[PDB]
Each structure stands twice: as structure tokens, then as C-alpha cells.
Amino acid sequence: PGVFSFLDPLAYEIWMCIVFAYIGVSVVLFLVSIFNSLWFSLGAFMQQGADISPRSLSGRIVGGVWWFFTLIIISSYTANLAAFLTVERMVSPIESAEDLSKQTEIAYGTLDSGSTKEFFRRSKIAVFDKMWTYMRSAEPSV
Amino acid sequence: GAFMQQGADISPRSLSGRIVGGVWWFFTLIIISSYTANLAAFLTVERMVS
Amino acid sequence: PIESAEDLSKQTEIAYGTLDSGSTKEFFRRSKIAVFDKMWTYMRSAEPSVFVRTTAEGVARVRKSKGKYAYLLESTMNEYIEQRKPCDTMKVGGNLDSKGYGIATPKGSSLGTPVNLAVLKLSEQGVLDKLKNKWWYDKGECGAKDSGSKEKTSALSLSNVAGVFYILVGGLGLAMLVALIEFCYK
Amino acid sequence: YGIATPKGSSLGTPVNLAVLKLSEQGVLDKLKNKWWYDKGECGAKDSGSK
Amino acid sequence: HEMLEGNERYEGYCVDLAAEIAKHCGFKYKLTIVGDGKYGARDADTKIWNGMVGELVYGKADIAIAPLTITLVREEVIDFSKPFMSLGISIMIKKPQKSK
Amino acid sequence: GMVGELVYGKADIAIAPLTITLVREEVIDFSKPFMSLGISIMIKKPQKSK
């Protein structure tokens, strides 16, 4: 585990851009209205974005687009964070024997000579046949 | 009443309280997002027991 | 992204060509069919030359185009490359014309008649359909469909989010322009 | 499919060669498309089903 | 291949098909590669046959087990058996992903 | 059938959808094929929307 597992659903690059847009919008709200306006824009990012415009309006449309901007990023992070977790549920922790022959990421092999390798050879069952045909031509030698 | 609507007024904004909730909003923004994501996978395919 | 073959002749963003000499190029030349005639007229006067020197060039030209070039060739070679790394090619739609390979004997040979009968017994016993299934899918280097189930791609990109930043700064550009026309009136 | 002639018939070799000339001149692909898509009844169910 | 000798040097579809044809017909066969490495064609000026189709006509081989495309120009000098694999011209595009 | 009328002299050539099988190639000569085919799937038009 660990703390990162937070920038896994959201790329490293986008974390720096949302902070730039945070200060990129907080500086536009400073010109429409040095320490009290930046303190207001932090109290504005805290709540959607952008007041004291008063009302009307320049400011209204600064955060009105920033709200739609910040409403989107939080919707994109939630969706992609749902995907990284659903794939872990859908993979099936290997459980039986036929599940091993359904994927090629976790390769498999037997002994080069013995009752194990000979069993997959002369096998008439469907499941064991695919495993041998795989391991017979699998490179490198499983 | 500040936990009710995101976080932290009566600073007002200026400023210390605004960063108390300003971080608390981002803190409560990620947690609520993490709830909907894990609960979605909980309604997709469930075992749901041994 | 493309299903049938008549669809790919209806656009020009994804240029298409064949081998510069062979059974494939001559088919479009003498084709009395409506769709295939329009394809030859385009490739006949397409610049730069959509034709390639060797068949190996036609596949390398599809893999380097990021999806802006398609090569026309036999269904055997196309289905075969689809099962080879990096699994970046894909057969789409049906076949254009009907053709086939065959075993050849000298005329008036003792092998002629027996071998010909021998091919049919193999085709009906599923031997030909099994050797085919052996040397392109069994000994292949890619799933297909076995790759649509083992989709282990859970990535996230920045290029998708860049649009919301555009409308933001574009909204701030309209905001500062409105800001400048609000400090003058009052 | 293929055209069949009795064994040892004088039509065997000539008609066999004839099928290749029709296939390589596109006449077979033309005749195929003539009685399948041209004279077909579902002109809107073949170009929209892709 | 530099450790083997004979038919066992080679492997592939037509290699396995060569055995099946020999088995259902009973004859000892020796897999040899075509001299010029070409398929079946006729020159424009010399009008001499080259490749595998040429070796059949001129008596340099006995049978051809290869991806030989059944064309009318070859059916005249040699005998083509029934087809063993139907094919046709298809499209090769850029598969996913893309991820564009 | 048709292959019967070829072998038994009651015909000279068969131009029809006659499947090329081994049992027939032994009694009559087939010409080169004019129309390749195979077994496929026929599903009903997907009832989209709904």
C-alpha cells in the first residue's frame, strides 16, 4: 500500500495543472475586485469558485467557468478511480486449474520428462489438450 | 454548520479559517469520490461470499 | 474503426495502396465493378506514391502511420500478421475477390489424379482447417479473441483533460475582456 | 461450388479453364453481385448494418 | 536447422501438409527449395517459365506444395489440384490502441 | 439427382450449386470453383433501442 495510491487514477501531470488553474483563476479574481483577495479566492476555491464580484459580474463568469472546470476534474477522477478497482474484481484470483489455461500473463510449464509431461501429451480431455499445445510451442521453453 | 456545507466560514476567508476548510473541502472531496467508486464495483459483480 | 471495404474508399484521410506489381494491383485495374473502379482511379493518381516496393513495406507503412494508412493484401497474410507482435494489425471486413492456393503437378503425371483426391479427404476430415488453425493462431504471438478478455490497460492520460483547461482559460480570456469593459462603464 | 462434368468428357478441360477466365475477368464477381445486391430488396439493410 | 539435415530442417504449414499428402498417397518425398525463390510466372521476351511452375514443366521437380495462386496462365502448362485454403484480398489497418 | 444424371448418361454438364465433396469427385470431374463459401452464423437484427 502507500500514500501514492492517490495519483494512480489521476496522472502526475494533471495534478500540477489543476494547481496552476487554482492560482490561474485566483489571480483573475484579484483584478476584478494583495493578501485579502488571495485569501478570498482560497475561500472561493473552498466553495466552488468566485465571489465579491459582487454579484456583477466579471467575477461571476471567472468562477462560473472555474466551477464547471472544477466540477469536471472531480468527475473525471471519480470515474478513472472506479476503473482501477473494477479490474481487480474482474480478474478472478486464480482459483481452479482451467483458469490457469485461460490467460497468458501467468505462464506455466511442467517437467521436461516424466509422468507429468506425458500426461498432457496423450490426454484426451479438452482442458488438458490446450495446455499442452500451448506449452509445446511456448517460447521460451516453459 | 461548516461541515454541513463543505467546510469553514466566518474567517471570513481572511484567512486562517478559510484554509482550515479549504484543505478540509479537498479532504472531504476525495473521500466522497472514493466512496462512489468502490461502491460501484460493489454493485457490478459480487461473489458475494465464501 | 473501419468495418467493410467500400467504407475505406469513401475517405482520403487514411490513404491506401497495394503492392506495385502482383495479383492485387492488376485486380483493381481490370475490375468492372463500381466500387473497385473508383479505388484504382484514386491510387492511379495519388501523391505521394501509395504503392510500395515489397509487401514487407506495406505492413511497415500501416504500423508507422498511427492509423492513417491501410494496406490491401491477401486474407492469409493479413490474418497471419494480425497474430504477430506487436499485435498492431487487424483484418476488417470480408474479402474482396475469391481465390485460392493449390498443389501443382506436371500435366499428364501419375501424381495428378491421386493427390487431387487426397486434398478433399483432408479438407473434409478437418485436417486442412486444423493445420491452418495451427500455424497462425496456435503458434501465434497474440490473443484474438483472447486479448479482449485479458484487457490489462487501466491507464489515465492528460490529453483528455486538456479540453477543460482550454475552455477555462478561454473563459478567463472572455472574463478579462468582460473585466476590461466593466471598469470603464463604472 | 463448382461445375461438374462426366469423367472422360470432352467438356472437362475446356469448361474448367473457362471458370478461371470468368473469375479473373471479374465476370463471376459481377454476376455474383448482380443477383445478390443489385436485384436485392434490402438496399437499406446492407449499408446501414455496418 | 544447421544441426538437422533433410526435411527436418524446415517446418511450417506446407511442411506438415507435405507429410499428410505423402501419407494419403504413399511416396517418399524430399523437400527442396525453389531455385530462384519466385512463384509462377513467364518472361515477356524469353517466354521461359521460372520458379516452381517452371521446374514442374521442365521436369526439374515432381510436385509443388506451396502458396501457389491458382491462375489461368498456370493452369495451361501444369495441373492445379483442388484448392486447400480459400482466401481473397482484405484490408490491414492499424489495430488498437489508439488510445488516441 | 444431378450427379446421377451425369454418371448415367442422362446429362452432359451440371451448372448448379453442387457442393464439391470427395465422394462426388471420384465419379464425376469437378471444374475449378467459381464461388467459395462456408458455414456462418445468422443472427436476428439486434433489436436496438428499446
Contact criterion met (CB < 8 Å) for C104 and E17: no
- Give the C-alpha separation, B42 to E18, whole Å: 56
Q: Render A64-83 in DSSP notation, one character per residue.
A: HHHHHHHHHHHHHHHHHHHH
A72, A75, A105: which to substitute to probe chain C, counting the most C Cβ within 10 Å?
Answer: A72
- Give the C-alpha separation, E90 to C72, whole Å: 6
Structure-derived torsion over alpha carbons of residues C108, C109, C110, C115, reported in degrees to the nearest 10: -110
Evaluated on CA atoms B10, B14, B20, B22, the torsion sign reads: positive
Asked if residue E64 lies in contact with residue E56, where contact means CB atoms within 8 angstroms, the answer is: yes
Structure-derived torsion over alpha carbons of residues D7, F37, E73, C50, reported in degrees to the nearest 10: 180
- Give the C-alpha separation, F1 to F9, whole Å: 12
- Give the C-alpha separation, F33 to D31, whole Å: 15
Asked if residue F27 lies in contact with residue F5, where contact means CB atoms within 8 angstroms, the answer is: no
Q: Render E54-100 in DSSP notation, one character per residue.
A: HHHHTTS-S-B-S--B--HHHHTTEEEEEEEEEE-EEEEEE-S----
Place of cell 474508399: C9
* Backbone φ and ψ of E3, nearest 5°: -105, -20
Question: Distances in Å between the alpha carbon of A81 and those of A35, B33, C160, C169?
Answer: 36, 9, 15, 26
- Residue E65 located in a structural domain: yes
Report whether the peptide linkage leading into residue E98 is cis, meaning its omega lies within 30 degrees of zero.
Answer: yes
| C-alpha closest to that of B43 among E32, E19, E76, A82 | A82
**DSSP annotation of D38:** I
- Residue E9 located in a structural domain: yes
Evaluated on CA atoms C113, C118, C123, C125, the torsion sign reads: positive
Q: Please name the helix (run of DSSP H) or strand (run of DSSP E) that holds residue D29, with its range, or none.
A: helix D27-33
Among residues 7-46 of chain F, which lie with CB inside 8 Å of chain C? 20-22, 25-26, 33, 35-36
Q: Which residues in chain E have Cβ-Cβ distances shorter than 8 Å to F36?
A: 83, 86, 88
What is chain E's length? 100
C-alpha cell at C144: 484474438
Q: Which long-range contacts (CB under 8 A, 24 or more apart) does A111-119 make?
A: none
* Pairing outcome for strands E41-42 and E49-50: antiparallel
CA angle E51/E56/E61 to nearest 5° reads 95
Question: Distances in Å between the alpha carbon of A32 and those of A58, C123, C180, C181?
Answer: 6, 81, 9, 11
| C-alpha closest to that of A87 among A105, A70, A75 | A105
Contact criterion met (CB < 8 Å) for D4 and F31: yes
- Give the C-alpha separation, E40 to A108, whole Å: 44
Contact criterion met (CB < 8 Å) for C92 and E17: no
B13 Cβ contact partners less than 8 Å away, ≥ 6 residues apart: A39, A40, A42, A43, A44, A46
Alpha-carbon gap: C105 to the closest alpha carbon of chain D (Å): 15
C-alpha cell at A80: 478513472
**Closest chain F residue to C125, measured at CA:** F22
C92, β-bridge pairs: E91
E:F CB pairs within 8 Å: 12
Contact criterion met (CB < 8 Å) for E82 and F20: yes
Asked if residue D24 lies in contact with residue F34, where contact means CB atoms within 8 angstroms, the answer is: no
- At D48, the amino acid letter reads G
D5, β-bridge pairs: F29
- Give the C-alpha separation, A57 to A65, whole Å: 13
SS3 annotation, chain C:
CCCCCCCHHHCCCCEEECECCCHHHHHHHCCCCHHHHHHHHHHHCCCCCCCECCHHHHHHHHHCCCCCEEEEEEHHHHHHHHCCCCCCEEEECCCCCCEEEEEEEECCCCCHHHHHHHHHHHHHCCHHHHHHHHHHHHCCCCCCCCCCCCCCCCCCCCCCCHHHHHHHHHHHHHHHHHHHCCCCCC
| C-alpha closest to that of C105 among E79, E65, E24 | E79
Alpha-carbon gap: A63 to the closest alpha carbon of chain C (Å): 9
Helices (H), chain F: 2-7, 22-25
> Is F24 annotated to bind ligand?
yes
Q: Which residues in chain E have Cβ-Cβ distances shorter than 8 Å to D21?
A: 72
Q: Which residues in chain C have Cβ-Cβ distances shorter than 8 Å to F35?
A: 98
Q: Which long-range contacts (CB under 8 A, 24 or more apart) does F24-28 make?
A: F24/D4, F25/C116, F25/C117, F25/C120, F25/E82, F26/C117, F27/D7, F27/F3, F28/D4, F28/D5, F28/D6, F28/D7, F28/F3
Evaluated on CA atoms A56, A58, A62, A64, the torsion sign reads: positive
Asked if residue C5 lies in contact with residue E91, where contact means CB atoms within 8 angstroms, the answer is: yes
Residue B19: how many CB atoms within 10 A of its CB?
16
Subunits with 3+ C-beta pairs closer than 8 A to D: C, E, F
Residue E21: how many CB atoms within 10 A of its CB?
23
Alpha-carbon gap: C165 to the closest alpha carbon of chain D (Å): 36
Return the CATH number at E40: 3.40.190.10
- Residue E100 located in a structural domain: no
- Residue E99 located in a structural domain: no
Spacing of C-alpha D21 from chain mean position: 11
Strands (E), A7-120: none
What is chain F's length? 50
CA angle C134/C140/C141 to nearest 5° reads 165
* Backbone φ and ψ of F47, nearest 5°: -65, 70
F45 Cβ contact partners less than 8 Å away, ≥ 6 residues apart: D45, D49
* Pairing outcome for strands C99-106 and E78-87: antiparallel
C:D CB pairs within 8 Å: 20
Q: Please name the helix (run of DSSP H) or strand (run of DSSP E) that holds residue E41, with its range, or none.
A: strand E41-42
C73, β-bridge pairs: E90
- Give the C-alpha separation, B14 to A35, whole Å: 8
Q: How determined?
A: X-ray
CA angle C48/C51/C56 to nearest 5° reads 125
Question: Distances in Å between the alpha carbon of A125 and those of A121, A132, C133?
Answer: 11, 11, 19
Report whether the peptide linkage leading into residue E67 is cis, meaning its omega lies within 30 degrees of zero.
Answer: no
Among residues 28-57 of chain C, which lie with CB inside 8 Å of chain E? none
* Pairing outcome for strands C69-74 and C15-17: parallel
C-alpha cell at C11: 475517405
Among residues 126-165 of chain C, which lie with CB inside 8 Å of chain A? 138-139, 143, 146, 149-152, 154, 156-158, 160-161, 164-165
Please give the residue range of the domain that contains residue E83. 1-94
Asked if residue C43 lies in contact with residue C28, where contact means CB atoms within 8 angstroms, the answer is: yes
- Give the C-alpha separation, A10 to C81, whole Å: 35
Report, in this order, helix, strand and coil percent for chain E, each rounded to 5.
Answer: 25, 20, 50
> Is C47 annotated to bind ligand?
no
The structural domain count of chain E equals 1
**Closest chain D residue to F14, measured at CA:** D4
CA angle F21/F22/F24 to nearest 5° reads 70
By three-state DSSP, how is residue F14 classified? strand
C15, β-bridge pairs: C69
A122 Cβ contact partners less than 8 Å away, ≥ 6 residues apart: none
Asked if residue A65 lies in contact with residue B20, where contact means CB atoms within 8 angstroms, the answer is: no
Alpha-carbon gap: D26 to the closest alpha carbon of chain C (Å): 6
- At C108, the amino acid letter reads G
- Give the C-alpha separation, C46 to A136, whole Å: 48
- Give the C-alpha separation, C17 to C50, whole Å: 5
D15, D20, D28, D32: which to substitute to probe chain E, counting the most E Cβ within 10 Å?
Answer: D20
C-alpha cell at C114: 491421386
Residue E27: how many CB atoms within 10 A of its CB?
13
- Residue E64 located in a structural domain: yes
Asked if residue A77 lies in contact with residue A9, where contact means CB atoms within 8 angstroms, the answer is: yes
Which residues of A belong to the annotated binding site?
Answer: 115-116
